[PDB]
Amino acid sequence: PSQVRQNFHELCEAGVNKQINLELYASYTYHSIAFYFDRDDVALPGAHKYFKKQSEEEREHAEKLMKFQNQRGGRVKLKDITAPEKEEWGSLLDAFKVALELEKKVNQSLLDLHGLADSKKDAQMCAFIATHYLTEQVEAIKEIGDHITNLKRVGTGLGEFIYDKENLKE
Amino acid sequence: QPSQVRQNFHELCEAGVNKQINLELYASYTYHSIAFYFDRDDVALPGAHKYFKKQSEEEREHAEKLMKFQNQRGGRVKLKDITAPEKEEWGSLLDAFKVALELEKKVNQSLLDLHGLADSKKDAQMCAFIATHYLTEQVEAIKEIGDHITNLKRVGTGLGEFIYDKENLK
Amino acid sequence: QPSQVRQNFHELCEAGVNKQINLELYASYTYHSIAFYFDRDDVALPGAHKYFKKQSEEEREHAEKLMKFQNQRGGRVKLKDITAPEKEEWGSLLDAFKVALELEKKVNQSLLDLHGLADSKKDAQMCAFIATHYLTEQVEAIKEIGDHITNLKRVGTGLGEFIYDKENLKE
Amino acid sequence: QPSQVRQNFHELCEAGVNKQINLELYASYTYHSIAFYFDRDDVALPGAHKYFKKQSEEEREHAEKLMKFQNQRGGRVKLKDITAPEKEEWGSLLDAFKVALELEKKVNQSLLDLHGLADSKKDAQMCAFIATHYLTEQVEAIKEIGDHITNLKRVGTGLGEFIYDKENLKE
Amino acid sequence: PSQVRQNFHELCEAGVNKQINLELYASYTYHSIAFYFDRDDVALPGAHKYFKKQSEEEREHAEKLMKFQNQRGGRVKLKDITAPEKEEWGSLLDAFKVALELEKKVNQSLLDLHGLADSKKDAQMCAFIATHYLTEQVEAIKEIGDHITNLKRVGTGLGEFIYDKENLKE
Amino acid sequence: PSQVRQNFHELCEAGVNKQINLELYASYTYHSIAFYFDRDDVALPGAHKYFKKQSEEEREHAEKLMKFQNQRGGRVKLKDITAPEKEEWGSLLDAFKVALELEKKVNQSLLDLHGLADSKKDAQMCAFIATHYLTEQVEAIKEIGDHITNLKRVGTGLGEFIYDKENLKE
Ligand SMILES: [Fe+3]
Ligand SMILES: [Fe+3]
Ligand SMILES: [Fe+3]
Ligand SMILES: [Fe+3]
Ligand SMILES: [Fe+3]
Ligand SMILES: [Fe+3]
Ligand SMILES: [Fe+3]
Ligand SMILES: [Fe+3]
Ligand SMILES: [Fe+3]
Ligand SMILES: [Fe+3]
Ligand SMILES: [Fe+3]
Ligand SMILES: [Fe+3]
Ligand SMILES: [Fe+3]
Ligand SMILES: [Fe+3]
Ligand SMILES: [Fe+3]
Ligand SMILES: [Fe+3]
Ligand SMILES: [Fe+3]
Ligand SMILES: [Fe+3]
């Protein structure tokens, strides 16, 4: 075993590797969404900028887990990053509904990971997940919630143009 | 018809937050009373006046942060009457701090109960929120009030109350 | 019996001030409720959340100024239960501002009554305090809310609500 | 019909760009793996960790510029799975830069093929794009990796690896 | 019972007092190691500086636990500080292996203390330990793992001089 | 024998090692006194700060002697640090009387060490001790004498609060 490994269970190591893959998957999906809004027949630059940023942040989420794996003396194990569900994402509202479903799936994954760590009495790993993931996920779901509400409010056409400029770009 | 953001948030936890919101508001109202008691012409302790107004304001912030939490998790804020404080007149500086210590310990037990409920429903995010934002401020507040009581017993009545008020509360 | 500072301050006027203090806190709590309703994920109007949060804080300040006045005059603050707000849910931006107009007019009438009472007891300093600090703020608040209602009717539902919230309430 | 912006852009060139995007992402993921390998407690080379993290990031930028180019020309981005890196463990600093040279040359050949395809369809825009942003960075990248390999052979294993990591990669 | 004491078990109070002694014992060991590297026949100034700093940090760890004891209304009980295991600590690599051993020993003590807190539903004591101690320890252990790896890599003689200058002095 | 050793007797080397232990024992006593004044039922923050600072200075005194040991080519030999004489230290005036006792005890130890140096014609060790230790000790003793006198003058209760604020906190 690694010289630094202490109170770190093989199932927890495995759970971190699974979460790294899911974070990379979310990153790639937002990347797809970002460049969909950059198409000449879509042309919502606020969404393009917003989802690009989201993609970057999800990559940082993966890196912090890779960093965590090494601190605890686990070994990073990488799998393929599955291509996103769709090639085209529809409206601003459609894209946000996809984002909410993705964020809730990631959140349930992190809640299962936390539960795993608690079951093995990994107090460090519980603290780490609670401090860096669980509140960002709640805040992210709430933010997407609000976007969906406002996108239904502003409607289609001019409303989308304005929401894109005022709320995603600025 | 669950909230679109709601995930791993029990109805009993929702109700527990609403109960804590009322308790925080109640504490704010009690400090407000105490603050204006020390502004009476026949009491006239400006340090205490300023101290307890600030305590009132902080308790209102504690309530707001739980209202914010309730909305983040997709629960619904339900407001009740704020009960008038226990007394119209609060006696000496020492008497007011003995009241505060009893209040803080009451609020603390309520936060420990609320944390216990969250843990019993495996609401790991709610555990972290309460630990991060409430449990250590409560411990620091109780210790601070203990030190105040100790010092108010030491300085005694009359000149000591005037000095303590100027040196430690103002 | 009376405070060493008390001069020309009738017990009915002392009682009137305690009743105004309660009304101010009641209005604070109502705006607080409204503020957190606009922060719900299924309403999500951040401009209104911010506006009503500030209104809540202001009304608490109006209560504090009265508690401070009570003590200046040597009256004694007497606090009562702060009644829960009328509604749990407040509907549209328009519905919320219509509630505010109603609330602000109720508070105004109460202050005008209190001023009446002060004058009936020839409490000139109390008349001056009420006129100086409350009667014009009240007039200005009711005008401001009237303008809000007019503009919320003009912009309509949907896009207009989003724009009004961002342009007028947030900024 | 075709995109309103599409002019002188062949479907095989579109396909080529999509294949290059996947390759750039593949390269990015490989450098990511290498980066975190050097962060292991039993490898502990902080310069190389920082260096390969930065290489991972730049490759992702290379991918983004081609997606941007795809949309500029009125083509459509088609994403495929990103294949996991070929190894879990990357050996020495020298071994890692040997993998990097192999990878950089493979990507260069794919860019030279893409350029040949552009020229074959008389896509002057695309030739110029590839030559301006890709062909020279790739030559510079290969030269840089070549110099790293030579220097890592010069310095030894052991002390030399620590010194090179701190003096050359941590910069 | 202290006026401030609430939800603080005697066994948790005892464990805090045990931890304080352990923190002070680590401090004294680091102090010894620091002054060994200052001997004219050892003369590694980077190590002297580094281990002095480690000695100072461990004393701070002890202080934070004494402060916590008082905050919770426990009473600080102090025991002899046992002299370090050796008078002489060998090579840079020998000293770092001692450090990894010590840090892993301390960490197990903190994981046990956290376990005790949890067994008594001391929610605030769990938060305290995880926030201030559990992640610091995992960072400390990883950093020492990294030192050992690099000290094996650089070898003895010239490598030790350079490591001491380039990594420990800076 | 150390390459650096010249005109340094074994008995002087032994006395330096004795002094180091005494400096560390004083440091630990001051640490105990410091954290007693931090208890919720004592709560004298000026004393807490003052005795913490004294604790830090005594550790520095120990360090300077370990440095001197190494400069002269003696070898540092460390012994257990004996727990302080009391767990509880009474009044501000009680703690200062303990301090005068401790400081006079240390000073006699330094005067004996100086005597030993002189008996071995260790001219540089006489200079070291007189320069760094003998006048500091006389200043320390006078300052504590002054505290005791002023603590008798101010009396208990209000006087202790004011002295703690006005003299020890500043
Ligand atoms: Fe994420
Ligand atoms: Fe890193
Ligand atoms: Fe996310
Ligand atoms: Fe509170
Ligand atoms: Fe808010
Ligand atoms: Fe409180
Ligand atoms: Fe008002
Ligand atoms: Fe005031
Ligand atoms: Fe108003
Ligand atoms: Fe590239
Ligand atoms: Fe772009
Ligand atoms: Fe490249
Ligand atoms: Fe420690
Ligand atoms: Fe302190
Ligand atoms: Fe440590
Ligand atoms: Fe000393
Ligand atoms: Fe030194
Ligand atoms: Fe001293």
Residue numbers in the entry:
A (entry chain F), E (entry chain L), F (entry chain L): 3 to 172
B (entry chain K): 2 to 171
C (entry chain E), D (entry chain J): 2 to 172
Report text from the authors:
Ferritins are well known as an ancient superfamily of globular proteins that are associated with the storing and detoxification of iron. In addition, they exhibit a capability to oxidize Fe2+ to generate Fe3+; and ferritins facilitate iron nucleation as their mineral core for storage inside the protein cavity, allowing the accommodation of up to 4500 iron atoms. Previous research has indicated that the marine invertebrate Apostichopus japonicus ferritin (AjFER) shows very high sequence similarity with other invertebrates and comprises known conserved functional domains of both the di-iron ferroxidase sites of the H subunit and the iron nucleation site of the L subunit, suggesting that AjFER is functionally similar to M-ferritin. Structurally, each subunit of almost all ferritins is composed of a characteristic anti-parallel α-helix bundle (helices A–D) and a fifth short E-helix (with the exception of Dps proteins) pointing inside the protein cavity. These subunits assemble into a spherical structure with octahedral symmetry, resulting in 12 two-fold, 8 three-fold, and 6 four-fold channels.
In this study, we prepared a triple AjFER-E25A/E60A/E105A mutant (MF), a double AjFER-D129A/E132A mutant (M3), and a single AjFER-E168A mutant (M4) by site-directed mutagenesis; heterologously expressed the three mutants; and further performed detailed structural and biochemical characterizations using a multitechnical approach. Generally, numerous experiments have implied that eight hydrophilic three-fold channels in most ferritins are considered potential gates for the entry of metal ions into the cage with the assistance of highly conserved residues, such as Glu and Asp. As previously described, the negatively charged residues Asp129 and Glu132 are located at the three-fold pores of AjFER and play a pivotal role in Fe2+ translocation to the internal cavity of the protein, at which Fe2+ ions reach the ferroxidase center. Accordingly, we prepared the M3 protein by site-directed mutagenesis and solved the crystallographic structure of the mutant at a resolution of 1.98 Å. The diffraction dataset of the M3 protein was integrated into the monoclinic space Group C121, with unit cell parameters of a = 192.83 Å, b = 130.95 Å, c = 122.62 Å, α = 90.00°, γ = 90.00°, and β = 119.40° and with twelve monomers in the asymmetric unit. Being mostly consistent with the structural features of the D127A/E130A/S131A ferritin variant in BfMF, the inherent hour-glass shape of the three-fold channel in the M3 protein was even wider than that in the previous holo-AjFER protein because of substitutions with relatively smaller alanine residues.
